[PDB]
Amino acid sequence: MVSKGEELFTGVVPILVELDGDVNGHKFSVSGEGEGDATYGKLTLKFICTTGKLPVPWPTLVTTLVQCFARYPDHMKQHDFFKSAMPEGYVQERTIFFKDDGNYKTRAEVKFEGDTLVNRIELKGIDFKEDGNILGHKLEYNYISGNVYITADKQKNGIKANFKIRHNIEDGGVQLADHYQQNTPIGDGPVLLPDNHYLSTQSALSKDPNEKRDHMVLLEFLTAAGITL
Are residues 52 and 27 in contact, defined by beta-carbon separation less than 8 angstroms? Answer: no
Breaks (C-N over 2.5 A) in the chain follow: 65
Are residues 202 and 143 in contact, defined by beta-carbon separation less than 8 angstroms? Answer: yes
Q: How many domains does the chain have?
A: 1
Neighbours of 54 (CB within 10 A): 22
Round to whole Å and give the CA distance between 55 and 139.
13
Are residues 34 and 45 in contact, defined by beta-carbon separation less than 8 angstroms? Answer: yes
> In CATH, what number is assigned to the domain containing residue 22?
2.40.155.10
Query: Which domain range does residue 38 map to?
Result: 1-229
Query: How many residues appear in the chain?
Result: 229
Round to whole Å and give the CA distance between 222 and 73.
11
Amino acid found at 224: A
Return the sign of the alpha-carbon dihedral for residues 71, 73, 74, 77: negative
What resolution in angstroms does the PDB record give? 1.5
Round to whole Å and give the CA distance between 147 and 151.
13
Are residues 179 and 63 in contact, defined by beta-carbon separation less than 8 angstroms? Answer: yes
Amino acid found at 194: P
Round to whole Å and give the CA distance between 203 and 187.
30
Amino acid found at 79: H
Neighbours of 6 (CB within 10 A): 19
Q: Using what technique was this structure determined?
A: X-ray
